[PDB]
Amino acid sequence: MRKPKITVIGGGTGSPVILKSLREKDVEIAAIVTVADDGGSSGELRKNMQPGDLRNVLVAMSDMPKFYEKVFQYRFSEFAGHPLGNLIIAGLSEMQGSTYNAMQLLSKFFHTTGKIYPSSDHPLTLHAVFQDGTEVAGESHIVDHRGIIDNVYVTNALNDDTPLASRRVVQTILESDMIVLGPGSLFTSILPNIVIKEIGRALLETKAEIAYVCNIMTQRGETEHFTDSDHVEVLHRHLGRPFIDTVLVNIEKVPQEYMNSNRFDEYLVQVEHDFVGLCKQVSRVISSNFLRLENGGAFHDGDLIVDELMRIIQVK
Amino acid sequence: MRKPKITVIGGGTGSPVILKSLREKDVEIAAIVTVADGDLRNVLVAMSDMPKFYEKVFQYRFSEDAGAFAGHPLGNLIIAGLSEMQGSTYNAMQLLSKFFHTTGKIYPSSDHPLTLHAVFQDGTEVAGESHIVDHRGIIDNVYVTNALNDDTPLASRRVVQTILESDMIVLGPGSLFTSILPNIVIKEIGRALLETKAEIAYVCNIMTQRGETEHFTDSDHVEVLHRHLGRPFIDTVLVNIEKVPQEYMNSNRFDEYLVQVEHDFVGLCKQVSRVISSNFLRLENGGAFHDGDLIVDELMRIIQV
Numbered sequence: 056m057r058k059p060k061i062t063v064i065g066g067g068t069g070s071p072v073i074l075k076s077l078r079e080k081d082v083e084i085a086a087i088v089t090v091a092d093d094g095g096s097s098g099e100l101r102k103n104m105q106p107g108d109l110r111n112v113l114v115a116m117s118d119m120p121k122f123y124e125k126v127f128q129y130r131f132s133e134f135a136g137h138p139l140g141n142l143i144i145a146g147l148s149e150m151q152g153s154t155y156n157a158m159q160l161l162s163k164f165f166h167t168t169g170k171i172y173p174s175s176d177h178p179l180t181l182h183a184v185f186q187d188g189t190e191v192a193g194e195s196h197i198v199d200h201r202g203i204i205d206n207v208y209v210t211n212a213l214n215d216d217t218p219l220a221s222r223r224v225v226q227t228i229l230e231s232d233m234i235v236l237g238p239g240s241l242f243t244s245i246l247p248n249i250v251i252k253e254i255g256r257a258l259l260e261t262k263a264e265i266a267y268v269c270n271i272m273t274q275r276g277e278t279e280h281f282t283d284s285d286h287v288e289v290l291h292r293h294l295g296r297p298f299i300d301t302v303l304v305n306i307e308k309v310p311q312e313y314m315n316s317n318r319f320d321e322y323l324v325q326v327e328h329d330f331v332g333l334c335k336q337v338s339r340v341i342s343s344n345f346l347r348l349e350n351g352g353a354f355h356d357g358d359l360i361v362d363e364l365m366r367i368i369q370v371k
Numbered sequence: 372m373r374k375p376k377i378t379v380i381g382g383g384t385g386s387p388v389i390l391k392s393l394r395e396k397d398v399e400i401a402a403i404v405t406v407a408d409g410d411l412r413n414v415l416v417a418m419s420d421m422p423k424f425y426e427k428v429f430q431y432r433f434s435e436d437a438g439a440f441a442g443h444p445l446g447n448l449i450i451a452g453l454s455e456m457q458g459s460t461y462n463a464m465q466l467l468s469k470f471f472h473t474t475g476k477i478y479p480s481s482d483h484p485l486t487l488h489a490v491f492q493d494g495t496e497v498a499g500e501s502h503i504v505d506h507r508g509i510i511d512n513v514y515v516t517n518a519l520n521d522d523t524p525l526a527s528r529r530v531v532q533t534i535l536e537s538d539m540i541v542l543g544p545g546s547l548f549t550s551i552l553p554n555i556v557i558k559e560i561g562r563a564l565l566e567t568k569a570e571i572a573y574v575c576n577i578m579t580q581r582g583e584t585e586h587f588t589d590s591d592h593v594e595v596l597h598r599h600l601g602r603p604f605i606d607t608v609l610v611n612i613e614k615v616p617q618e619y620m621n622s623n624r625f626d627e628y629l630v631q632v633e634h635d636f637v638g639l640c641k642q643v644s645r646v647i648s649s650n651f652l653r654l655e656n657g658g659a660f661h662d663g664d665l666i667v668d669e670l671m672r673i674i675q676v
């Protein structure tokens with residue numbers, strides 16, 4: 056029998072430990088990331104503009120992840136106090152004119168294993184609509200805009216045509232045994248991928264099991280009572296129909312004392328749990344301890360997550 | 372048969388050309404470089420899994436629009452950041468190699484970081500490489516000390532064994548006083564060169580350098596190497612006899628005081644058993660450079676396992 060095939064979509068915060076654990080298993084891995092608001096197509100002056108989804112996936116799928124985490128994370132103190140490795144992605148992107156144009160150089164540089172694909176082969180802009188109706192374009196701008204995000208959408212930077220998937224992307228989704236959405240920020244990591252029509256169709260049609268790994272914590276632009284159920288609801292609304300087959304949610308408590316002592320943003324809280332609402336929406340709901348309290352934060356435990364995923368995975 | 376084992380000692384602009392050609396041949400390569408308080412950088416890129424890639428990446432500089440970072444090269448950022456992480460460039464050598472996915476072996480010459488010292492013909496002493504090249508005068512001799520203590524510099528782990536087990540040692544090309552000699556004035560390395568059964572080959576410079584007289588002939592380069600190691604030790608010497616045209620030099624903005632090395636066959640023959648005088652000149656990127664393939668073709672033709 057062939058190795059199972061697993062495609063991770065989003066690649067936000069928490070995906071590197073999932074990707075590490077997946078690599079220890081006997082499985083092929085593909086990652087899909089959005090690379091938007093990019094280069095000459097961003098509509099910004101060159102001085103004005105100068106993200107982690109790509110960096111996280113690149114380092115996690117590199118030939119020496121431990122090595123490259125150490126390296127892509129050290130900070131000068133000496134310039135003066137900036138992270139090395141953020142400077143490498145900055146450099147190659149400036150060199151090539153956009154991060155999109157740098158992506159093949161970047162996979163060469165990190166000696167990546169498996170496939171990393173952009174969601175589209177054309178330049179994309181990310182748009183957020185806030186609760187009051189205000190529309191903001193650009194991830195860095197969205198993230199800086201005060202308020203609660205209602206919805207996101209993507210457009211082509213260079214024209215009014217409907218954005219299109221990069222097609223090796225469609226085939227990858229359709230030929231997978233499992234799709235892992237997340238973990239990552241819902242609005243700025245996961246959703247930009249699924250709002251491209253050809254990707255939303257592939258998710259709907261794939262024989263793969265679709266698994267969503269929910270956040271440990273609420274994010275900027277999310278309310279205190281934005282439940283795990285609510286996260287599933289937003290995903291389903293953005294794609295246009297229900298489509299998650301399995302949802303994994305953490306129910307182990309993040310102690311207040313740990314959040315206080317570790318100087319967490321005081322408005323980020325543990326994602327509230329709504330079992331009834333999850334069950335109404337998703338066939339298989341997995342609530343368990345998937346929490347790792349280490350390195351000053353409340354992160355996903357990659358192995359506890361991936362052990363569940365390997366238990367349910369089936370070759371299609 | 373076995374693959375021949377070739378150790379390359381020194382290098383300027385220089386070694387990368389020789390290392391590139393050697394990599395095309397079926398040979399095991401070791402490189403020995405001097406680490407002070409450059410040549411390391413060029414050997415790292417030359418021995419990497421993607422030299423053209425790393426060369427481009429290395430030398431891109433942030434643009435005028437990169438605010439605070441504007442103008443700084445990417446590769447120097449990398450080498451300086453790993454250096455700082457490890458406490459020194461010397462400390463960072465293993466990580467440097469791992470990153471460039473280097474083939475073969477790269478060794479620092481010495482067991483600690485060094486300071487180069489030069490004694491000038493008028494008796495003046497200057498410490499530090501940059502200070503030496505900037506001092507007005509003619510260099511008589513160089514020696515090395517450890518930067519952090521007064522102990523005799525020793526060879527790093529494996530360097531003596533590597534020299535002794537080699538089929539051939541290639542010295543140069545590169546600045547004699549600041550690239551080649553600092554490696555061989557480490558006493559353990561000098562002794563390893565005197566004792567090794569490896570064929571010792573010296574590739575002479577195309578052009579004279581700072582610290583050297585206009586009439587510093589190929590033969591005088593050999594005399595200086597021999598004098599620093601204390602005995603004759605070079606088995607083969609490869610010298611270029613093709614003329615670097617003056618119009619070429621003028622067009623490409625060459626320094627006027629520096630001339631092409633003068634050929635002295637009789638003097639060479641008095642000192643070294645095998646003297647190879649031929650066209651090893653490549654006039655290419657606004658420079659007078661060594662042709663790596665022609666030099667390496669000659670060396671391969673001489674080599675025995």
Ligand SMILES: [Cl-]
Pocket residue numbers: 068069270271272273
């Ligand atoms: Cl989280």
